[PDB]
Amino acid sequence: EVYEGKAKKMIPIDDDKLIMEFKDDATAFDGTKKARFKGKGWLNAQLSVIFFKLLEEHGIKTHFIGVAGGNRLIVEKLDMYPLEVVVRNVVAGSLKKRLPLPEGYELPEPIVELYYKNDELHDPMINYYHAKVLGISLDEIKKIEEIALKVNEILKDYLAKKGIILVDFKLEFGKDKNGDIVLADEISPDTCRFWDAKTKRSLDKDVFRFDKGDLIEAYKEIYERITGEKPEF
Amino acid sequence: EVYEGKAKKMIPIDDDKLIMEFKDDATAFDGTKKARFKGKGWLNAQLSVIFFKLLEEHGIKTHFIGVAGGNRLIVEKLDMYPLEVVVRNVVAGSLKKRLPLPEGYELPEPIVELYYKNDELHDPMINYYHAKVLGISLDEIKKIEEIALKVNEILKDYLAKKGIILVDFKLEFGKDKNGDIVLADEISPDTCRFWDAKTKRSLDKDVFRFDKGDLIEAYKEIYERITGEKPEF
Numbered sequence: 001e002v003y004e005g006k007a008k009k010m011i012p013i014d015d016d017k018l019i020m021e022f023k024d025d026a027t028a029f030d031g032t033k034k035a036r037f038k039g040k041g042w043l044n045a046q047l048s049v050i051f052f053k054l055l056e057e058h059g060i061k062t063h064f065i066g067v068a069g070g071n072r073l074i075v076e077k078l079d080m081y082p083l084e085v086v087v088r089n090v091v092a093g094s095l096k097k098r099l100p101l102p103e104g105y106e107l108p109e110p111i112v113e114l115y116y117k118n119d120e121l122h123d124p125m126i127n128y129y130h131a132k133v134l135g136i137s138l139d140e141i142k143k144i145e146e147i148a149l150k151v152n153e154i155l156k157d158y159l160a161k162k163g164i165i166l167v168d169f170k171l172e173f174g175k176d177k178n179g180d181i182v183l184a185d186e187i188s189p190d191t192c193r194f195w196d197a198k199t200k201r202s203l204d205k206d207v208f209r210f211d212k213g214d215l216i217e218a219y220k221e222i223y224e225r226i227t228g229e230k231p232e233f
Numbered sequence: 234e235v236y237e238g239k240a241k242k243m244i245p246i247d248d249d250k251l252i253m254e255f256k257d258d259a260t261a262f263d264g265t266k267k268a269r270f271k272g273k274g275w276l277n278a279q280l281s282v283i284f285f286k287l288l289e290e291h292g293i294k295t296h297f298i299g300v301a302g303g304n305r306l307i308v309e310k311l312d313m314y315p316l317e318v319v320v321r322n323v324v325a326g327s328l329k330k331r332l333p334l335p336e337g338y339e340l341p342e343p344i345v346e347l348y349y350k351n352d353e354l355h356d357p358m359i360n361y362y363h364a365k366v367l368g369i370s371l372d373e374i375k376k377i378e379e380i381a382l383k384v385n386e387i388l389k390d391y392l393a394k395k396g397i398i399l400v401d402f403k404l405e406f407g408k409d410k411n412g413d414i415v416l417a418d419e420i421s422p423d424t425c426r427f428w429d430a431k432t433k434r435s436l437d438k439d440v441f442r443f444d445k446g447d448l449i450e451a452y453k454e455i456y457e458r459i460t461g462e463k464p465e466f
């Protein structure tokens with residue numbers, strides 16, 4: 001059986017591999033807002049590949065194995081932590097409701113937030129003690145955050161050289177058969193906030209969230225600035 | 234000028250001392266539910282004194298200096314951290330909305346949660362990174378939690394020998410002139426969950442929160458079980 005999530009489908013290959021297929025569907029505000037954008041899947045697939053390859057070069061262990069053409073990646077099957085790990089460099093989104101700081105406030109150092117993946121409870125934020133009750137040891141949490149913080153440096157530096165501010169982003173992790181902590185899911189304009197360095201405008205899912213313009217146009221601009229090429233689809 | 238909070242008034246004495254006066258007012262659900270209970274102030278004052286004295290004996294630094302008769306304590310003036318520090322031994326209250334665990338679930342080890350004191354944002358939970366942005370260093374946070382966890386052991390052990398389960402409780406802290414971290418505010422049936430060991434019933438502000446019975450009767454039962462004496466008022 002294939003798992004069909006809000007944005008991607010996961011097709012089993014064997015015991016240790018999956019196909020991650022990116023859909024054109026977009027959801028927001030915990031699923032209340034919905035639309036489909038032709039080519040969104042392709043862009044998010046291609047961009048994930050570029051980011052995973054960049055991170056692998058820097059010695060980040062990711063689930064990325066290869067491409068299966070189109071909107072499909074081949075990825076290592078992992079035993080997933082029930083976490084969303086959010087790294088924040090610039091104040092935006094939900095952080096404005098947690099710290100009395102304005103949108104665009106540049107953080108002196110990165111913030112890491114842990115969210116417990118649980119639909120029933122609406123993905124509440126947790127700390128290290130909650131994580132322990134969930135079966136995640138302090139060492140594991142520490143290794144996870146150390147990876148997220150390294151990922152942050154690499155992506156923000158890379159993107160800055162392209163005139164893009166990495167505002168924040170969301171990661172997921174799992175364990176491989178050796179018990180190593182492996183970066184999973186996706187890295188795309190769906191799961192990151194990207195702002196133009198010159199204009200400060202959103203080139204990410206916030207365009208869809210708040211009707212700030214044309215989503216495909218914004219995701220394309222990201223692809224074009226990153227690759228140097230115009231997207232083929 | 235005197236500071237008048239929801240439950241207590243703080244009267245300045247000199248440069249380094251305050252009077253903490255406990256009122257009969259009770260509030261719940263971030264101030265939406267209100268009532269007054271005659272003698273509540275007295276009970277919460279007396280009980281805070283007993284707890285602060287118990288903790289001082291165990292080498293916990295608290296703001297407790299002495300009594301000024303009635304509902305008034307003399308306390309050291311501190312430069313307060315903008316935090317509420319919650320220690321949890323048994324699942325109850327807001328934790329049920331954060332972990333899919335039932336009320337009464339006994340935790341394998343204590344949970345410490347940090348809340349940023351901010352009316353505008355409704356006291357959101359924060360982690361160590363948020364605390365840093367707020368000007369609280371990691372060392373400070375670590376010392377705070379180490380104290381809270383020690384306080385927990387002492388109170389839970391003490392209360393268990395009296396047939397009372399310490400379910401959770403909320404602490405506040407500030408810095409003294411030497412830059413030491415000093416336990417502040419109050420320790421009472423207002424700020425702790427106390428359950429009868431035999432019956433599991435609430436002997437705390439939850440009685441008022443959820444109309445579980447007579448608040449004064451419940452606070453009295455706590456006083457009587459702790460002191461061995463019937464409250465004089």
Ligand SMILES: Nc1ncnc2c1ncn2[C@@H]1O[C@H](COP(=O)(O)OP(=O)(O)O)[C@@H](O)[C@H]1O
Nearest residue numbers: 005006007008010063075076077078080184185
């Ligand atoms: N390497 C992996 N192994 C197993 N599961 C993964 C891996 N990477 C991502 N996942 C999970 O696969 C699903 C990806 O599809 P998605 O549309 O994002 O689903 P959802 O809407 O549940 O987040 C998610 O449940 C995600 O946690």
Ligand SMILES: Nc1ncnc2c1ncn2[C@@H]1O[C@H](COP(=O)(O)OP(=O)(O)O)[C@@H](O)[C@H]1O
Nearest residue numbers: 238239240241243296308309310311313417418
């Ligand atoms: N030692 C102390 N020094 C300075 N302020 C304190 C001390 N202990 C408690 N406080 C503060 O004094 C007030 C106590 O009264 P309270 O009725 O609880 O007010 P509030 O409704 O604002 O919590 C709180 O603002 C508390 O943080």
Ligand SMILES: [Mg+2]
Nearest residue numbers: 005006007185
């Ligand atoms: Mg997802």
Ligand SMILES: [Mg+2]
Nearest residue numbers: 238239240418
């Ligand atoms: Mg108070």
